[PDB]
């Protein structure tokens, strides 16, 4: 009975900076030409989402935030073709529009209409479907998964499996497919090659999973923080290694380890020195190190390139380098089909109400990710 | 009647930094176990042998210096399979050994017998070949070409085409090669692209060639000396640009000009700054830029990694990754096929005995290429 009308129900809304989100009453507008509007069943709290609320990833607000989810389709606007009434979903932070320079491209997945780069806070058509009190509230990179109830274009969803487990599957909205992809699409790791993974969060295991998937025969983990390695090898990290345990730089212990350099090395942090760390530690020659992860501050980093002259590779993604809306469906098809567990990266489930509490426990660094239910 | 024994001949010492070369005679011990000894024909004067000159490319005086050559074997030592007496050859500064963890890997050619990063200045042994009023002088790079006579190890020489004009396939010994690889090889530039080369030289216009190979559509040449620019033309560069014209920094010209960036770009000049350019005017999402040309002085440079984060790839290499034993004959054979020509590449010829002219035209920026003869 919602179909074509507006829907009033609870969203979690950032009236400002450096505050908790407020549960709010909301009205969701219903979805014009090409929109989706989805009811949302699960969505995981991510870092970025946090860097909104310290305004170090500066998108406009008011918002209502969240960008990892599932859910189900509530109605479809006019000429929408990819979906339907009652489809299972996974809306897609990364659009793929299909016809850009970028989604034409073989390698390419970062599509030119993203909200990323210089984010709007809108829709592809420039409004926002979500009022409080009346006053407009922004949409985050085109998803807004914090409410129970959102509307987003075409371009940014995904059919998926009509039997997912909804809980587990929205990690596919991004911190998984961030890390499995950085490894088995971006780096192309290979047989019997030997990894290295620095930052040891979600992220991080999501990468290790996907270095074990490739082949890899030797998978070191890294961390400044012990507690974080028994589920790094629960994954298939083969060792792992602390930098405050030594009296070496850590490239210089991870060179002699790996008899000279790794193959593939991941920065999977977001401090400045690690990603220079993880690119000199790979084989001078022939080694590929991948920025996974970055600082929201957004600086600049000190490095010699004479790393890059005999031979190195230093590259990078989003998204895992996955095109997202041909991705996703067969990566949760790989998820039914056993191919690899979401458990292990599921620390804390709790009721969408206590979402301050969730982002409480990513910011004491207990969480590895907490999944917030409707 | 030269085989087994010592030969006196004439060769260019540089008995210390920031002089310029004496032409002494020169005793060249005969070739010991798995070494070869060359009659230099030609040799070309390379911008690395400068840096020999100024210090800035540190390895142990004195010295012959010299690095891309041809020449023919006079005589060879016990167990030496790859050449014989009288075979036409060129000399490798990154050797082939065949055997280390880089020369089996498929990609790598960054052979670890080399003596680039930490110099030795001597044959694989660790003694030298040459003697000047007894006192004992350093090889360079295991080559040492300003000699009417040099010795290098078997894994540091080439056969080639027993009907080659040395005078002009002696480029492939390192300019030539180090450009047309970086293009062809390390960058595999496609059909259709949208290159753009940093630095105008000799090498950097051996990289246009091999973008023009490759089968590019745009090749954009840019350089801040105007005289630079015929010359790429002719090669292959389908347009110019001095960033001194504009008002605008030459990526932001470069992005509009490429209408969002570029598919591949190259730096071949050697300050730190230029890298960042090339690296910034190529594709989001998925462009790939080139390190080739490094200044010597060896220092850091300051850079955003956001620019790899959207999908950038940054890579470099030696001899434009291409691994030398192998890729040399091919190379060769391929210019006595005509599918390139090296004419544009030779400005300025001179006799052995006017090194220290060569030097001159390569210090005020006239020559291209100046190729020493015997
Ligand atoms: C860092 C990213 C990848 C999230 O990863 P994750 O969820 O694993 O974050 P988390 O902090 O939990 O994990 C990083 C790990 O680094 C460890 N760490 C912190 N400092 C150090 C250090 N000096 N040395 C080693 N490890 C360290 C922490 O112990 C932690 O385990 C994310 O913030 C990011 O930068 N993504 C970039 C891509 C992007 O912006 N996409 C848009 C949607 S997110
Ligand atoms: C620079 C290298 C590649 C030699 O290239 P080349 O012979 O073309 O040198 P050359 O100076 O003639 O060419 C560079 C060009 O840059 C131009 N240039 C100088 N400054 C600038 C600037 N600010 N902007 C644009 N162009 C510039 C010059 O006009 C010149 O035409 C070489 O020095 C090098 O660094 N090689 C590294 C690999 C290596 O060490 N191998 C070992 C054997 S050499
Ligand atoms: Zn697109
Ligand atoms: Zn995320
Ligand atoms: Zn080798
Ligand atoms: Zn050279």
Redesign the interface.
Known sequence: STAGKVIKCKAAVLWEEKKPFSIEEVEVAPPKAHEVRIKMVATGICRSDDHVVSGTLVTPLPVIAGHEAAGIVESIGEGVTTVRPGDKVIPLFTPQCGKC??CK?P????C?KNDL?MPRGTMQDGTSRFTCRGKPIHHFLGTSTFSQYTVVDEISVAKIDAASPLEKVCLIGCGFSTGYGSAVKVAKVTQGSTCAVFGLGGVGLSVIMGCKAAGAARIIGVDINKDKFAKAKEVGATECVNPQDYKKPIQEVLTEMS??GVDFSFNVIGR?DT?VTALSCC????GVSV?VG?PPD?????????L???????????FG?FKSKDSVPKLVADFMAKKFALDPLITHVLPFEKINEGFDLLRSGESIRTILTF
């Open positions: 320079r970028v491209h390698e390419g997945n970062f030119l780069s008899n000279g400045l990603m084989q001078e020659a022939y920025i970055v957004s600086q600049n980093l000190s490095m010699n390139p004479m890059l002259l005999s031979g190195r590779t230093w590259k990078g993604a989003i380098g």
